[PDB]
Every structure is written in structure tokens, then in C-alpha cells.
């Protein structure tokens, strides 16, 4: 009875695997064997932002590549100057278990959310002095993992209830709900043009979504354990997944299969964060073994290590102009590098 | 000097922010943060009621505050989360004293596996668990006047023969004490099997009418603090 439908689902899996195999006769490395290696990349902690009491789950850059928001489990959103090390704002949260923070692309707003299932929107550029709460977005049944502003009125929030949700900030009501993953969703990455976003979850699968209706375009399944971080390539035709099987992998949307895996035997801890630089030649991944590794995204070898953190690296970010990378960490310190 | 007047008053702003961050750091370190774990059968909510007497629809975490002797405790019961917990449990690596509550009267091997997985979890090591072997009364009626036995679901209990008890309750029947000790021993076997020194488990025999559960967290907590101070003052 029902086993007929499940067997036909297995046959659909078989045909999908056959198609993905037939569209590949050469790996990324063969096509990019003759490209010049990046050499050794050395990056030094130019600034060090301190002031967070507890571990830092998330940081998000501003679009001006100078402002920076970070969330910490003491329950602070702090906004930094990151040129000078000044604290532009220090917002206290109502729930001190925030897993994510986002900074509006205009620079007007920050959202944090976290283990309270609500995405709180904070208004920075108020005519009034203090940063007050725009609204709370309460429609998720599991902790918020990631949140990204599309604009001042649309934010995509990932959750531990296995669903991503698109919101309308004026109304506070879900414009769309994305409901494909079986394991809870850990990271989120809007496309460069904000027509799509990839989503990595605790089912070891990444899903490409279309944020116009709310249906999954593609599913990418190459990892072994659950996927902790995702990030589109600058192009928008690829993305890198930072997983818990101690690997990073590059998937591309158009071929729709894995391109390379960025792994080395010495690494036996999970990835916590990924980021590309500006040209996508340089994938930066944070690890549980306390130090970010810089990956040549086209050779698949390490070139450079951001080893300066006492605890695990919980977040990463490259500036929109690419001048800097900031790494937060569970030791409660943010470091800017160049 | 080499920065304008705008930069000056910006730095005055950042320093005024440091002043508030320091006041909050003084608030944040004098408070002890307890993660309360447990199952559906465990009297977890009743223990929370016990500290409340001692002290919003889809809320994803709960939070109760109590103080024992001028020390602020801050207990984080988990609310509307899903069944899987290998991610949101990492948020509690730097808490004092996970408070694990189990249903003693029994499902008990499920509690043993929960304890074993909390204990051996990276990012949850270095946290000392405080077992509340709950529902002791129900365990008494289940053993002393019951057909259900611990010999099944746990074959190595027929050959148990209680160790020399220090000072049980006078009303406790030898069999009641034997089972009550076997269950606690069953948990402490996991506790001592892998957590060498950075870990302690503080078992207790608590009931639904137990009005000393707040103090038994204070004493354990005090002792968990003392071990941390011993390692950070280089005294050990």
C-alpha cells in the first residue's frame, strides 16, 4: 500500500542521483588544476572588540563595512565602530539566549532572536535617542537559528522547528513558511539579488528556496552530519556549507551537486561558520578547535589560519567591501583581521 | 589630538557605554545560572514550583529566579523546543550546575541515557550535574508493597546487596533503601566513569513534598563554586 509510494520516492532518488552523476565528468579541481595557488595568506588581528560578558553566538556586519553588531549570551546586542573600537550602541535583550543577530541593510535596524522563538526587531536610527524594539516576530515553535533582513520590512528567519519563515515587519505576520527540512535549520544565506536563499539544517541537507512563493527549488545532500553554516558565493551561483562532520563543501545551484569538500585530517571538529571574501577565492571557516581556517575555495587546501581565539569560533563575517573579517568567539572577544 | 571633536565625543559615548557594561558585569557574575533538565514523568514542574514558593504562548525557554541565602539563582527550564536537543543544549555550556531530575519510580534507563549523554557531551563537560532522584515516595510504594520489581529492566540488582548505608530514614524498609541506593548508584556509575575531576554529580533523594530542594542546590552550588575557585586561584 503505502510502501508503493515510498518505493517510488526511492526510485525518484535513484533518478536524481543518476542525473547529478551524468552531469559530471570532471571535478572542480581538474577544471581548476592550472590556476595559480593563492600562496600563504596571513591575516593579523588589527582590532579586538571586547565588552561582551559571555560567549558570542553571532555577529553581522553593516553594509557600510564599518559598523558591526554582535550578540552575546549575556544578553547584549552591541554595535561597534570597528575602525575605532567605539561602541555605537549596547542594546540589552529580554532573552539572554540569542543565537543570531542581523543588521538591516539600510543600517536602520537590528534583529536578534534566539532560544525564545521570537525575532525581535530593534530600531537604531530613531529620531529619539535610545534603540527601542520595533516589534517581536512570534511564529516559530523552535529556537531561531538565523535571521536576515531582505529590506526594512522583510526578514527571513530560520528556526529549530525545521522551518524557515519569511516575515512582513509592519504586520508581524509570516508572509511565507518554508517547510522542507526534517532536521532543524541552523543557518541561512540570502542570495546576492535576494530572490533565493539557501538553508542548512540538522538533517545533513541544504535546500535552495525561492522567496516568491515558498517552495524548495533544490536539495543538496552531500554532507555526513548536520550542517552548521551556509553562505552564498559572491556570484550567487554557488554556496559553501560548514558542517559538523568536520568538512566544508561547495555546492553550486546550476549543476546542482557538490563541487569540492574542504577537509584535512587534522580537523576533527565541526565547522561553526563559513564566509567567502569578495572574489570567492577565499572561503573562511570557523571551527570548534578554536581557530578559523582560511580555505582556498578553488584549490581546496588551507592557506592561512586565524588562530587567536581562546574558545571555539562561533561566528564570522566579511565586510561588504571585503576589507576585513571579524570573528566572534566563545571567549567573548571579537577580532577584526586583514 | 589626531582625532577630531566628533571622534572625541564618540569616545566619551563608548566609555559611557563601558560604565553600563561594567555595572551589568557586576550583576552578571553574582548570579548563578542553572539549566534544569528532565523528562515528562519527572516532577520537573513541581520542583520549579518548589523554588517559586521559595523565591507567551509558544515561549521557547522559561526562566525562574530564586535566592537561598542572598545569592541569586537563575533557573532555565526549557519550553517549546523540539525533541532533538543536540544544538540548543550548547547554549548552556557556561552554566553552574545543570539540575537533572529523574523519575526514580519506574523509562529509568532512558533517564540513565539522558544523564550519560549530558555527562559525556563536549561543551557540557566541566558542568557539574545535580541529580534529583525524584518521586522517592512512589518508589517506596512501588518496591515495598508491589509486584513490580527492579530485577527486570535491571538484572544486576538481584545480586546487589546494599552497601553499608550511612544513616537512612528510620521508616525506610531495608528493601526500600536497597532499591533507593541501587538507582542512585546506577547514576553515579556513569558520573564517575568518565568525568575525572572537572565534574561532580550531586545526587539527591527528593519528593513532591520535599521543601529543602532549594538549599540542596545552594550547598551543591557552593561546592561547585569552590572547585572552580580552587582551579582558578592556582590552589590546586
Amino acid at each position: 500500500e503505502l510502501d508503493q509510494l515510498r518505493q517510488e520516492a526511492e526510485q525518484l532518488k535513484n533518478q536524481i542521483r543518476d542525473a547529478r552523476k551524468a552531469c559530471a565528468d570532471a571535478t572542480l579541481s581538474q577544471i581548476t588544476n592550472n590556476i595559480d595557488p593563492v600562496g600563504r595568506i596571513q591575516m593579523r588581528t588589527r582590532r579586538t572588540l571586547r565588552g561582551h560578558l559571555a560567549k558570542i553566538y553571532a555577529m553581522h556586519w553593516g553594509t557600510d563595512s564599518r559598523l558591526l553588531v554582535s550578540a552575546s549570551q549575556d544578553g547584549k546586542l552591541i554595535i561597534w565602530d570597528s575602525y575605532t573600537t567605539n561602541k555605537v550602541h549596547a542594546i540589552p535583550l529580554r532573552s539572554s539566549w540569542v543565537m543570531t543577530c542581523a543588521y538591516a541593510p539600510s543600517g536602520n535596524y537590528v534583529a536578534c532572536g534566539g532560544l525564545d522563538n521570537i525575532c525581535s526587531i530593534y530600531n537604531l536610527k530613531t529620531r529619539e535617542g535610545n534603540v527601542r524594539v520595533s516589534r517581536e516576530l512570534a511564529g516559530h515553535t523552535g529556537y531561531l537559528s538565523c535571521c536576515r533582513f531582505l529590506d526594512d520590512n522583510q526578514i527571513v528567519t530560520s528556526s529549530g522547528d525545521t522551518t524557515c519563515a519569511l516575515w512582513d515587519i509592519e504586520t508581524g505576520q509570516q508572509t511565507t513558511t518554508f517547510t522542507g527540512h526534517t532536521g532543524d535549520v541552523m543557518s541561512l544565506s540570502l542570495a546576492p539579488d535576494t530572490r533565493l536563499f539557501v538553508s542548512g539544517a540538522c538533517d545533513a541537507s541544504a535546500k535552495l528556496w525561492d522567496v516568491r512563493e515558498g517552495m524548495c527549488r533544490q536539495t543538496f545532500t552531500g554532507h555526513e552530519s548536520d550542517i552548521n553554516a551556509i553562505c552564498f558565493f559572491p556570484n550567487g551561483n554557488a554556496f559553501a556549507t560548514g558542517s559538523d562532520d568536520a568538512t566544508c563543501r561547495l555546492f553550486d545551484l546550476r549543476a546542482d551537486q557538490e563541487l569540492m569538500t574542504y577537509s584535512h585530517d587534522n580537523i576533527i571538529c565541526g565547522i561553526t561558520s563559513v564566509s567567502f571574501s569578495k572574489s570567492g577565492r577565499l572561503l573562511l571557516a570557523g571551527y570548534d578547535d578554536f581557530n578559523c581556517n582560511v580555505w582556498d575555495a578553488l584549490k581546496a587546501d588551507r592557506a592561512g589560519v586565524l588562530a587567536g581565539h581562546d574558545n571555539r569560533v562561533s561566528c564570522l563575517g566579511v565586510t561588504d567591501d571585503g576589507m576585513a573579517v571579524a570573528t566572534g568567539s566563545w571567549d567573548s572577544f571579537l577580532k577584526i583581521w586583514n | 589630538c589626531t582625532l577630531s571633536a566628533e571622534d572625541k565625543a564618540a569616545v566619551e559615548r563608548s566609555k559611557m557605554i563601558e560604565k553600563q557594561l561594567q555595572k551589568d558585569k557586576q550583576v552578571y557574575r553574582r548570579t548563578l545560572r542553572l539549566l534544569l533538565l528532565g523528562a515528562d514523568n519527572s516532577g520537573k514542574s513541581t520542583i520549579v514550583k518548589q523554588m517559586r514558593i521559595y523565591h507567551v504562548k509558544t515561549s521557547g525557554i522559561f526562566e525562574t529566579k530564586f535566592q537561598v541565602d542572598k545569592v541569586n539563582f537563575h533557573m532555565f527550564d526549557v519550553g517549546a523546543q523540539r525533541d532533538e536537543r543536540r544544538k540548543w543544549i550548547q547554549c548552556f555550556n557556561d552554566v553552574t550546575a545543570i539540575i537533572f531530575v529523574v523519575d526514580s519510580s519506574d523509562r529509568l534507563q532512558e533517564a540513565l541515557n539522558d544523564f550519560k549523554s549530558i555527562w559525556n557531551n563536549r561543551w557540557l563537560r566541566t558542568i557539574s550535574v545535580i541529580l534529583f532522584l525524584n518521586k522517592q515516595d512512589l518508589l517506596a510504594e512501588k518496591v515495598l508493597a508491589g509486584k513490580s520489581k527492579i530485577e527486570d529492566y535491571f538484572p544486576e540488582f538481584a545480586r546487589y546487596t546494599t552497601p553499608e548505608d550511612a544513616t537512612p530514614e528510620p521508616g525506610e524498609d531495608p528493601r526500600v533503601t536497597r532499591a533507593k541506593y541501587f538507582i542512585r548508584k546506577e547514576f553515579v556509575d556513569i558520573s564517575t566513569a568518565s568525568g575525572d575531576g572537572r565534574h561532580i554529580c550531586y545526587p539527591h533523594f527528593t519528593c513532591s513534598v520535599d521543601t529543602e530542594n532549594a538549599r540542596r542546590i545552594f550547598n551543591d552550588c557552593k561546592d561547585i563554586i569552590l572547585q572552580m575557585n580552587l582551579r582558578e586561584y592556582n590552589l590546586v
Partner: single-chain antibody, 233 residues
Framework: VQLVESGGGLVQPGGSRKLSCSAS????????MHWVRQAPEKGLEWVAY????????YYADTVKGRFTISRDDPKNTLFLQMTSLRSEDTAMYYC??????????????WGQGTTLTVSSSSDIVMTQATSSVPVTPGESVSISCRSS???????????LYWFLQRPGQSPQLLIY???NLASGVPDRFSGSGSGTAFTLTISRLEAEDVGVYYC?????????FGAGTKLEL
């Protein structure tokens, strides 16, 4: 979001005057507070300053040590004493707040500050063009100003403001740091510059865009102004 003050009026050339301020509309204790004074048939003059978390209290070079700018974060007031009143310091006082952080817009909203009258130097100079420039609506005016000292710090920004005033109500900020438009200012006002002399461009000069176009520098603390160009219809 109002700033209102008290007192003010006739005073003797040696009388103690307690010129308070009231700010019961915003987050007082996050803002720097200046004072700026308007000489009646003249331009308007910079006065004391008190930063957020009173720790920097600058003063002018003409009143330095006379009237003790203070603060009261609970009561939300800028209490001021004053006793000397050298017969020409009596003018129209303004209470401007300013917040200082990256991207912030200082000198945004000014008070009223009544017009008490007496009954009887290596600063910068902000010189402007002809003080009238009469133009009818629809034409693009380009009134400018001159700075003796180059307003361009090595940061990369020019610390030049632009204000408008009206026959009556207080002034406002149009474009702070010579480019960035203020909040409630129409996109018709604009600004461009080279470092020492440059201008703001308006397009559709309606009945409320008429007034005196003062100007400020913000590199050092004389916080100087100009005589102001009064555009007529």
C-alpha cells in the same frame, strides 16, 4: 521631542539670572547639549557645551568662566546660572542637542530659549557671501560660505553644517557634515565641497524655504557661525 526653557527678560548688568532648560520629550542622557545664542539683529553665537555623561564641558572665548552650564539627568533639565551679563551678552538663547557616534547627525533639533535683555583668539571664521541673494521660487540658489581653516580632517569627512531659520521659529539642520541631509528636509537641499569654501543647492524655493542660511564648522570648539544669508522672495 520638545525642548523648552524658563525665566528670561529684563536684567541688571550685574544680576544673577537662572536660565534653565527643560527637555521632556526624548532620551536626554544620551545626547550632548550645546547652547547657541542669537544676537538680535545679528548672527547667532556658540555658547557652552556639555557632553553625554558630563565629562567634557567646553566654553566659548567670550563667556568662559561666567555662567556654569550644568545638567540634571533625572529632572531632564539644563540648569544655568549667570550673573555678569556684560551688557552685550544678552541675546536669544538656543538649546541644541547632539549625539556623537559614527554616522550620527549632530545639531538636529533646537529649542526656543527666550530672549532676556540687559536694562542699560585663534578660532575659525565662517564668512558667507552676500547676505540677501533675492530669488523667486523655482530657481536653483547656490549660497555658499567660507572657512578660514580647512574643514577636512584626515578621517575623510568635512565638519561643516548648514542651518535654516525662519521669521519666528528656531533654526533646524539641513545638511550636516556638508553632504548628508537631515531627517525632515526635502531632497531639494543638497551639498558639495572642496575643503574651505563651498555651497548648498536648493531647487524649489517655496514659501517656507525662506530665511537666513547660517552655517557651522565642527573641527575645534569655538563652534563658529556666520552672519547668515537671508534669501528674500
Amino acid at each position: 521631542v520638545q525642548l523648552v526653557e524658563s525665566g528670561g527678560g529684563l536684567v541688571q548688568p550685574g544680576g544673577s539670572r537662572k536660565l534653565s532648560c527643560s527637555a521632556s520629550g526624548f532620551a536626554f542622557s544620551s545626547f550632548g547639549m550645546h547652547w547657541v545664542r542669537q544676537a538680535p539683529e545679528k548672527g547667532l553665537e556658540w555658547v557652552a557645551y556639555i557632553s553625554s555623561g558630563s565629562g567634557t564641558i567646553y566654553y566659548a572665548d567670550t563667556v568662559k568662566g561666567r555662567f556654569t552650564i550644568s545638567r540634571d539627568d533625572p529632572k531632564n533639565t539644563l540648569f544655568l546660572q549667570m550673573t555678569s551679563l556684560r551688557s552685550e551678552d544678552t541675546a536669544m538663547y538656543y538649546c541644541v542637542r547632539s549625539i556623537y557616534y559614527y554616522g550620527s547627525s549632530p545639531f538636529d533639533f533646537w529649542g526656543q530659549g527666550t530672549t532676556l535683555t540687559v536694562s542699560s583668539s585663534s578660532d575659525i571664521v565662517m564668512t558667507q557671501a552676500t547676505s540677501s541673494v533675492p530669488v523667486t521660487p523655482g530657481e536653483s540658489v547656490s549660497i555658499s560660505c567660507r572657512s578660514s581653516k580647512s574643514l577636512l580632517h584626515s578621517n575623510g569627512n568635512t565638519y561643516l553644517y548648514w542651518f535654516l531659520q525662519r521669521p519666528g521659529q528656531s533654526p533646524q539642520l539641513l545638511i550636516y557634515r556638508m553632504s548628508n541631509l537631515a531627517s525632515g528636509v526635502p531632497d531639494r537641499f543638497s551639498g558639495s565641497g572642496s575643503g574651505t569654501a563651498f555651497t548648498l543647492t536648493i531647487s524649489r524655493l517655496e514659501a517656507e524655504d525662506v530665511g537666513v542660511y547660517y552655517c557651522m564648522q565642527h573641527l575645534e570648539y569655538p563652534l563658529t557661525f556666520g552672519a547668515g544669508t537671508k534669501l528674500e522672495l
